[PDB]
RNA sequence: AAAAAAA
RNA sequence: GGCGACUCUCUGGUCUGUAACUGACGCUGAGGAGCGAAAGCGCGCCGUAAACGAUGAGUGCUAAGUGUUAGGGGGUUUCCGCCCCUUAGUGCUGCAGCUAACGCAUUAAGCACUCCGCCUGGGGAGU
């Protein structure tokens, strides 16, 4: 149960990197909770924003 | 309307009719218009109302009256009720109340009358007649009353104590585990009577626990005298005459890779990289068909066994230990006879050229699976230096494996990677530790090589068009898979395909998505419970779970009778050239009866192995009553939920320990939901449990929930 | 003659409806558990939803559909059956979407 | 709470059948077991003189035909009023066998009880008369409401 | 509970 | 009091670290001013609210154990890693002490000091 971002040393999540973000959403495309993905709280927020800015820009779906 | 109803009833009254769904009835009647389809549905409703047809709970229509019944096998329970498993597996189970069993026992083929009224969700029924009696022996614990004995059956599905008349005692004392042969069955209120056939010993003596398992399934004991005479007469070294017409390979670099504790080395391998970039793979299997000839003592016994069995403490072999650990064994640095499968394999893992032939080998080194992992994965410099001449081949094996694995998975083979237990005992048979059995790189390498050799042998003989034995795995049950597909849409996994025409790759798509999720273990486990078991047959029907069209077992004839036959058919058809009509008719008669038997001897090995494991897990947990462990809800039922630990030990949380709320089971979600609290325990949640009780005899571990 | 469509399934606790449309939401065909003559508890059941979808789908294949987006409404037991009735009728399911209000 | 043991009757001294004794005790009035011991031994001599068979061959055959297999039991859970088909326990089979045999034998038209009991046994053995009918009657009734249980 | 495959 | 889509513009406060500087420049604070529910009614006005963890504010001192949020240093660490000290906040247990008891317990209701609001039988009466 390790954080992706702490692990790989990633300090900035980018809403344009869709193929990363897709690791953290469900197949429906709901965001996955932090207790499932191992993510740090710190990153979960960042991640949460990114995905939201993605979704606005139709890079991810709101609902698959 | 009435003429259509008659026509449907007459169609269903044909002798060849099996119970069909509405869609199957639509297809069989060639109904193509939407209005004729409405006519069928109204007819099926009207006939079902009249009681002239019956809808089973698997949504299949059958004429009761030809039955008013269903033929099937009893699956008894320990509380006194049962289920009918129909012969037509597409039909649903029929619940049988304890009063309506009418002397039926577990495994009995019966006929059951269908009750018009059901008191619950499932269709009820009464046993009217017993066609075939399954149980003829019963193991148990003997007990001595004043003027008569009884025996308490270890199979708790036998709810009633077996009466022993005083002349049937045969020396059995209080607390002795005993075999008992049935003289009579239960009748009305009278129990089954018997006679003690065998005394095992006392129930507190070490090893009687397992021995009781061995007797419960009816597993083979010691070898017959004529087999042990044949085994004792078999030479311990190869005769020079046997080297005739065998390809000498003694100078090549060949190695066995097995477990550290394995003495029955079936397989030895080699990998040479060719100049074009393709790989040459030699698979060299122990030539058991030479030393165990057709219709010798050992052969008759090895047919009666069907397989070796691998219980916790001991191995019940298929063939004698003198043969299986001596001359057939591909022991290190000694001349051994083999039947080889040598394969040229290109840069996409396709076999371009193959040859199956008789050989003699001399194995360069006996490796282990732990040593081979240390050389490849851990990069261990001491072990490399020790095995310096083999290190280049071990890296050439690794790359070939990967190429064969990448092919397999692209063809759509289902990798069902689950955690299995290995129990560790002492010399007495008492349990030391339950650890995870990890599939490393060295095992998966050997796995892939064996697979391709088994694939290459099968394919060669299918095109030959001679009678042969195949290892088949049919398509899974369409109803069971329909229920599996539903279950995964709850977690959000959306599959492409229907339950009657799934390609294996679609199931692999699920198993890749769930990888490293909490849901994994259970969706994994629930898919499994939609799969059919693999069996042997004489027909090539393909293997679903390897997604191949041609497969047999060739690579272990020490410990599988079907493999030993594959070695005889190879010697018959390829080496000897006996492809005459009389040879073919002989084997074409015999293989359906071997295939059916050996299949049933495998399922009797598995059931028994598992039953020793579950016993020794339970033996493990007796000193852990009170202790708190993290786990994961493996299953949820109307009576509770099962929890798996991180050493794979399973235990129940009974609803009666869920004291914080009145829990209702939701069948669709797979969950226990509280009415008041709104707490929801689901399949796949992580929970902490405490050990409450452990019953070794029953093989029960009871848990209580400390927290989520 | 339109190929792509949406299969609007409403599964209530009483009933399963299935409308099949074009992409601009014009109604190709429909069916329902009640249209097939089921009544009461039967209309709720996933079997009735299955059969509803087939009747809706076989109406659509006459107009010449091939691919279906699915939109599900309501808490009923049909949606999982009724979707696999669309796959089994023949029509491929691109994506489903729960649009419960 | 725990099924009381039924009283262990002696075997009938001349037919060595605890069934035949149980008949005597069923026939006995006002503790006059003598009257009933006489009546049966008179009735079984009548059966043996007519048929030629042993009275035991006939009497056991008579009981087979009177003895019920399924019975109606009133169940009123909520509404219900369900006449639950209940299987007659083997002791209650003989009970109802001997009860009906005696009850209908007493109702017959023949002058003496020894003849009345003989004729009811002979009719029961031929799968006819009133006591066999009574078993049929409750089975017809149990078959009629068989959809409960 | 419940699959391959290995042993 | 509250404040949960995302983006952008403008703006407030907080914490950590080092001390470059300042050199007691602080604290509390009646009144007053501003903010401030459904409010209640014509956005304005209303101006009170269990607007009560029922616990003024500021500062210092006084066993522990454990969790989390944002940090700081060291340790090896490739990094991650885990390990440890330390800071601010937020939690659960638990001393000493305090309480009528319930409890509180370095987020004190403990031990001290400064300043403010407030209480003094119930009802009558928030008349």
Exposed / middle / buried, residue A52 (Cβ in 10 Å: 0-12, 13-18, 19+): middle
Token match 């197949």: residue? Answer: A27
Q: How far is CA D92 from CA B174, B439, B534, D66, D103, in A?
A: 37, 65, 52, 12, 16
C67-73/C92-93 β-pairing? parallel
Closest Cβ–Cβ partner in B99, B117, B189 for D148: B117
Tell how far CA C85 is from the center of its chain: 8
Query: What tokens does B165 get?
Result: 């008349």
Give the separation between CA A49 and CA B220, rounded to whole angstroms. Answer: 66
Task: Point out which residues pair with B267 in neighbouring strands.
Answer: B285
Task: Point out which residues pair with C30 in neighbouring strands.
Answer: C19
Residue B146, Cβ neighbours under 10 Å: how many? 4
Instruction: Return the residue of B nearest to C76 by Cα.
Output: B668
Give the CA B161 to C1' F55 distance in Å: 70
Give the separation between CA B211 and CA B177, rounded to whole angstroms. Answer: 9
Query: What tokens does B282 get?
Result: 């030699």
Give the CA B688 to C1' F98 distance in Å: 39
Give the separation between CA B577 and CA B570, rounded to whole angstroms. Answer: 9
Query: What tokens does B671 get?
Result: 């969950």
Task: Point out which residues pair with B654 in neighbouring strands.
Answer: B640
- Looking at residue B657, the DSSP 8-state letter turns out to be G
Spell out the residues 6+ positions from residue C7 whose beta carbon is closer than 8 angstroms to its own: C18, C19, C20, C21, C53, C56, C57, C68, C69, C70, C71, C86, C91
Give the separation between CA B550 and CA B50, rounded to whole angstroms. Answer: 49
Residue C95: its chain A contacts at CB < 8 A? 64
Instruction: Return the residue of C nearest to A63 by Cα.
Output: C97
Give the CA B696 to C1' F65 distance in Å: 39
CB contact under 8 A, B493 and A27: yes
Residue D89: its chain B contacts at CB < 8 A? 189
Which phi and psi angles does B19 have, rounded to 5°? Answer: -60, 130
Best residue in B488, B489, B516 for a mutation probing chain A (most A CBs within 10 Å): B516
Tell me which method was used to determine the 3D structure.
Answer: cryo-EM
Pair B65, B52: CB distance under 8 Å: yes
Residues contacting strand F at CB < 7 A? A 2, 6-7, 9, 40-42, 45, 48-49, 52-53, 56
Give the separation between CA B107 and CA B430, rounded to whole angstroms. Answer: 32
Pair B306, B596: CB distance under 8 Å: no
Give the separation between CA D70 and CA B109, rounded to whole angstroms. Answer: 25
Give the separation between CA B44 and CA B4, rounded to whole angstroms. Answer: 10
Q: Give strand letter and number of the nucleotide nearest A49 (CA to C1').
A: F6
Which of B542, B611, B510 lies closest to B214 in space, CA to CA?
A: B611
Give the separation between CA D4 and CA D8, rounded to whole angstroms. Answer: 12
Spell out the residues 6+ positions from residue B501 whose beta carbon is closer than 8 angstroms to its own: none
Pair C5, C21: CB distance under 8 Å: yes
Pair B596, B563: CB distance under 8 Å: no
Query: What tokens does B84 get?
Result: 């009918």
Q: What is the largest CA-CA distance in chain A?
A: 30
| Chain B, window 661-680: residues with a beta carbon less than 8 angstroms from a chain C beta carbon | 668
Q: How far is CA B312 from CA B280, B407, B424, B433, C30, in A?
A: 38, 35, 8, 12, 60
Which of C61, C56, C10, C12 lies closest to C35 in space, CA to CA?
A: C56
Give the CA B543 to C1' F123 distance in Å: 92
Which of B280, B382, B295, B407 lies closest to B340 in space, CA to CA?
A: B280
CB contact under 8 A, A64 and C98: no
Give the CA A54 to C1' F70 distance in Å: 27
Three-state SS letters, chain D: CCCCCCCCCCCECCCCEHHHHHHHHHHCECCEHHHHHHHHHHHHHHHHHHHCCCHHHHHHHHHHHHCCCEEEEEECCCCCCEEEEEECCHHHHHHHHHHHHHHHHHHCCCCCHHHHHHHHHHHHHCCCCCHHHHHHHHHHHHHHCCCCC
Which of B329, B335, B325, B330 lies closest to B362 in space, CA to CA?
A: B335
Query: What tokens does B207 get?
Result: 């090893």
Instruction: Return the residue of B nearest to C60 by Cα.
Output: B34
Query: What tokens does C96 get?
Result: 């489903």
Residue B583, Cβ neighbours under 10 Å: how many? 16
Which of B629, B348, B578 lies closest to B464 in space, CA to CA?
A: B578
| Calculated CA dihedral for residues D48, D52, D57, D61, nearest 10 degrees | -90
The SS3 of residue B490 is: helix
Q: Min CA distance, D65 vs chain B (Å)?
A: 19
Q: Give strand letter and number of the nucleotide nearest A7 (CA to C1').
A: F80
- Strand E-contacting residues in B 262-281, CB cut-off 7 angstroms: 262, 264, 266-267
Residue D149: its chain B contacts at CB < 8 A? 115, 117
Give the separation between CA B303 and CA B565, rounded to whole angstroms. Answer: 10
Spell out the residues 6+ positions from residue B133 whose beta carbon is closer than 8 angstroms to its own: B105, B108, B185
Which of C89, C75, C63 lies closest to C13 in space, CA to CA?
A: C75
Pair B63, B17: CB distance under 8 Å: yes
Pair B464, B573: CB distance under 8 Å: yes
The reply to whether B259 Cβ lies less than 7 angstroms from strand E is yes
Which phi and psi angles does B322 have, rounded to 5°? Answer: -65, -40
- Chain F positions with an atom below 7 A of a protein C-beta are 5-7, 68-71, 79-82
Residue B22: its chain C contacts at CB < 8 A? 51
Pair B255, B265: CB distance under 8 Å: no
Three-state SS letters, B183-220: CCCCECCECCEEEEEEEEEECCCCCHHHHHHHHHHCCC
Please report how many Cα atoms fall inside a 13 Å half-sphere around the Cα of residue B89, on the Cβ side: 8
Residue B460, Cβ neighbours under 10 Å: how many? 20
The reply to whether B685 Cβ lies less than 7 angstroms from strand E is no
Give the separation between CA B654 and CA B662, rounded to whole angstroms. Answer: 12
CA quadruple C76, C81, C84, C88: dihedral sign: negative
Spell out the residues 6+ positions from residue B680 whose beta carbon is closer than 8 angstroms to its own: B671, B672, B673, B674
Give the separation between CA B363 and CA B269, rounded to whole angstroms. Answer: 9
Instruction: Return the residue of A nearest to C98 by Cα.
Output: A63
Q: How far apart are the first and last CA of chain D?
A: 24
Which of B64, B154, B76, B59 lies closest to B110 in space, CA to CA?
A: B76
Query: What tokens does B675 get?
Result: 């009415």
The SS3 of residue B425 is: strand
Residue B99: its chain D contacts at CB < 8 A? 87
Closest Cβ–Cβ partner in B115, B117, B188 for D90: B188
Which of B270, B299, B296, B297 lies closest to B285 in space, CA to CA?
A: B270
Pair B230, B343: CB distance under 8 Å: no
Query: What tokens does B206 get?
Result: 């070490």
Which of B69, B59, B66 lies closest to B92 in space, CA to CA?
A: B59
B109-114/B149-153 β-pairing? unpaired
Tell whether D90 lies on the interface with B, counting CB pairs under 8 A. Answer: yes
Give the separation between CA B606 and CA B169, rounded to whole angstroms. Answer: 32
Give the separation between CA B488 and CA B117, rounded to whole angstroms. Answer: 33
Residues of C with CB under 8 A from a CB of A: 95, 97-98
Residue B253, Cβ neighbours under 10 Å: how many? 16
Pair A37, A2: CB distance under 8 Å: no
Give the separation between CA C65 and CA C82, rounded to whole angstroms. Answer: 17
Which of B356, B707, B689, B332 lies closest to B555 in space, CA to CA?
A: B356
Give the separation between CA B25 and CA B39, rounded to whole angstroms. Answer: 12
- Chain E positions with an atom below 7 A of a protein C-beta are 1-7
CB pairs under 8 A between A and C: 5
Residue B295, Cβ neighbours under 10 Å: how many? 7
Give the separation between CA B589 and CA D36, rounded to whole angstroms. Answer: 72
Give the separation between CA B152 and CA B207, rounded to whole angstroms. Answer: 19
Residues of B with CB under 8 A from a CB of A: 492-494, 513, 517-518
Give the separation between CA C6 and CA C24, rounded to whole angstroms. Answer: 9
Which phi and psi angles does B343 have, rounded to 5°? Answer: -135, 130
Burial B404-413 (b: 16+ CB within 10 A, else e): bbebbeeebb
Token match 């001359």: residue? Answer: B327
For residue B446, the surrounding DSSP H or E stretch is helix B441-464
For residue A35, the surrounding DSSP H or E stretch is helix A34-37
Give the separation between CA B378 and CA B670, rounded to whole angstroms. Answer: 42
Three-state SS letters, B47-86: HHHHCCCEECCCCCEECHHHHCEEEEEEEECCCCCEEEEE
Give the separation between CA B108 and CA B85, rounded to whole angstroms. Answer: 11
For chain A, how big is the Rg over CA atoms in Å?
A: 11
For chain C, how big is the Rg over CA atoms in Å?
A: 12
The reply to whether B521 Cβ lies less than 7 angstroms from strand E is no
Tell how far CA B694 is from the center of its chain: 27
Pair D27, D117: CB distance under 8 Å: yes
Spell out the residues 6+ positions from residue B15 whose beta carbon is closer than 8 angstroms to its own: none
Q: Using N-to-C axis directions, what is the helix angle for B520-528 and B504-513, rounded to 10°?
A: 160
- Looking at residue B323, the DSSP 8-state letter turns out to be I
Q: Is A26 left (phi over 0), alpha (psi -120 to 50) or beta?
A: beta
Q: Give strand letter and number of the nucleotide nearest B415 (CA to C1').
A: E4
Give the CA B182 to C1' F119 distance in Å: 92
Give the separation between CA B214 and CA B217, rounded to whole angstroms. Answer: 6
Positions of E strands within B254-408? 255-258, 267-273, 279-286, 309-310, 315-316, 335-345, 351-362, 365-368
Q: Give strand letter and number of the nucleotide nearest B261 (CA to C1').
A: E7
Token match 């037919």: residue? Answer: D15
Residue B418, Cβ neighbours under 10 Å: how many? 11
Q: Min CA distance, C38 vs chain B (Å)?
A: 9
């Amino acid at each position: 149960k390790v954080c992706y971002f702490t692990s790989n040393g990633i300090t900035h999540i980018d809403y344009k990197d869709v193929d990363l973000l897709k690791k953290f959403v469900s197949e429906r495309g709901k965001i996955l909770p932090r207790r499932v993905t191992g993510t740090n709280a710190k990153y979960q927020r960042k991640l949460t924003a990114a995905i939201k800015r993605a979704r606005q820009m139709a890079l991810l779906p709101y609902v698959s | 309307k009435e003429a259509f109803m008659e026509k449907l009833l007459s169609f269903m009254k044909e002798e060849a009719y099996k119970p069909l769904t509405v869609q199957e009835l639509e297809e069989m009647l060639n109904i193509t218009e939407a209005e004729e389809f409405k006519e069928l549905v109204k007819a099926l409703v009207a006939l079902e109302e009249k009681g002239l047809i019956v809808r089973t709970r698997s949504d299949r229509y059958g004429i009761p009256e030809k039955m008013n019944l269903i033929k099937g096998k009893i699956s008894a329970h320990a509380k006194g009720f049962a289920f009918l498993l129909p012969e037509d597996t597409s039909l649903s189970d029929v619940f049988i109340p304890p009063n309506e069993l009418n002397t039926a026992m577990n495994g009995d083929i019966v006929m059951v009358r269908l009750n018009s009224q059901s008191s619950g969700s499932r269709q009820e029924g009464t046993v009217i007649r017993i066609l075939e009696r399954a149980i003829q022996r019963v193991v148990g614990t003997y007990t001595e009353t004043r003027n008569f004995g009884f025996v308490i059956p270890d199979d708790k599905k036998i709810t009633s104590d077996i009466f022993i008349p005083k002349n049937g005692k045969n020396g059995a004392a209080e607390g002795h585990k005993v075999v008992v042969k049935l003289t009579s069955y239960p009748e009305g209120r009278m129990n089954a009577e018997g006679e003690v056939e065998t005394i095992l010993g006392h129930k507190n003596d070490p090893g009687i626990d397992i021995l009781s398992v061995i007797h419960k399934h009816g597993l083979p004991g010691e070898f017959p005298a004529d087999a042990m005479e044949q085994a004792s007469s078999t030479p311990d070294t190869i005769d020079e005459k046997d080297l005739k017409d065998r390809r000498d390979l003694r100078d090549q670099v060949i190695v066995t890779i097995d477990g550290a504790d394995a003495k029955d080395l079936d397989d030895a391998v080699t990998v040479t990289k060719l100049d074009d970039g393709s790989y040459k793979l030699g698979v060299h299997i122990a030539d058991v068909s030479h030393y165990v000839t057709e219709n010798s003592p050992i052969d008759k016994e090895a047919l009666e066994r069907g397989t070796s069995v691998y219980l916790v403490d001991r191995v019940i072999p298929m063939i004698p230990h003198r043969l299986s650990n001596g001359i057939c064994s591909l022991n290190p640095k000694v001349d051994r006879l083999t039947l080889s499968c040598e394969m040229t394999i290109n840069s996409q893992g396709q076999v371009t050229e193959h040859e199956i032939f008789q050989s003699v080998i001399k194995t360069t080194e006996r490796m282990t699976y732990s040593d081979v992992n240390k050389i490849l994965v851990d990069d261990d410099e001491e072990l490399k230096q020790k095995y310096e001449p083999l290190v280049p081949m071990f890296k050439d094996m690794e790359r070939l494996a990967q190429i064969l694995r990448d092919k397999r998975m692209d063809r759509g083979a289902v990798d069902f990677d689950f955690k299995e237990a290995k129990v560790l005992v002492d010399d007495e048979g008492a349990v030391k530790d339950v650890v995870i059995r990890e599939r490393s790189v060295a095992e998966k390498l050997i796995e892939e090589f064996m697979l391709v050799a088994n694939e290459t042998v099968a394919e060669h003989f299918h095109w030959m068009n001679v009678p042969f034995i195949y290892r088949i795995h049919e398509e899974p049950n369409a109803e069971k898979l329909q229920k599996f597909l539903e279950f995964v849409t709850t977690f959000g996994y959306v599959v492409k395909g229907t339950a009657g025409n799934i390609h294996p790759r679609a199931l692999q798509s699920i198993l890749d998505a769930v990888r490293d999720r909490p849901e994994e273990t259970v969706i994994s486990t629930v898919m499994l419970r939609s799969m059919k078991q693999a069996k042997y047959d004489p027909q090539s029907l393909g293997h679903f779970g390897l997604s191949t069209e041609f497969y047999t077992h060739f690579t272990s004839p020490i410990r599988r009778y079907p493999d030993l036959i594959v070695h005889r058919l190879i010697r018959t058809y390829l080496i000897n050239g006996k492809v005459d009509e009389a040879t073919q008719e002989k084997w074409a008669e015999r293989l359906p009866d071997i295939a059916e038997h050996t299949s049933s001897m495998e399922r009797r090995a598995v059931d028994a192995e598992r039953e020793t494991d579950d016993l020794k897990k339970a033996e493990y947990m007796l000193d852990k009553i009170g202790e708190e462990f993290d786990g994961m809800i493996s299953s949820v039922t109307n009576f509770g939920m099962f929890v798996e630990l991180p050493n794979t030990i399973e235990g129940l949380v009974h609803v009666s320990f869920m004291t914080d709320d009145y829990y209702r089971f939701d069948e669709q979600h797979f969950a226990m939901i509280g009415e008041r609290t709104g707490n929801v325990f689901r399949i796949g949640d992580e929970i902490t449990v405490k050990v409450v009780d452990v019953n070794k005899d029953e093989r029960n571990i009871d848990f209580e929930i400390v927290g989520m | 003659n339109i190929e792509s469509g949406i299969a609007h399934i409403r599964s209530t606790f009483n009933n399963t409806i299935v409308t099949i449309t074009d992409t601009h939401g014009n109604a190709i065909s429909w069916s329902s558990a009640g249209a097939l003559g089921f009544r009461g508890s039967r209309k709720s059941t996933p079997f009735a939803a299955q059969m509803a979808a087939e009747t809706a789908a076989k109406g659509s294949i006459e107009h010449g559909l091939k691919t279906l987006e699915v939109t599900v409404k309501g808490p009923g037991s049909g949606r999982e059956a009724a979707i696999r009735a669309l796959q089994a009728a023949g029509l491929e399911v691109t994506a489903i979407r729960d649009v419960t209000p | 709470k725990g099924p009381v043991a039924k009283r262990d009757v002696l075997p009938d001294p001349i037919y060595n059948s605890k069934l035949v004794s149980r008949l005597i005790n069923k026939m006995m009035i006002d503790g006059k077991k003598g009257k009933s011991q006489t009546i049966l031994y008179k009735s079984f001599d009548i059966i043996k003189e007519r048929t030629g068979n042993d009275a035991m061959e006939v009497f056991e055959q008579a009981l087979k035909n009177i003895m019920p297999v399924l019975e109606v039991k009133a169940r009123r859970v909520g509404g219900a009023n369900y006449q639950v088909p209940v299987e007659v326990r083997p002791e209650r089979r003989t009970t109802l066998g001997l009860r009906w045999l005696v009850n209908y034998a007493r109702l017959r038209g023949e002058k003496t009880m020894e003849e009345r009991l003989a004729n009811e046994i002979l009719d029961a053995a031929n799968n006819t008369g009133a006591a066999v009918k009574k078993r049929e009657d409750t089975h017809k009734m149990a078959e009629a409401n068989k959809a409960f249980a």
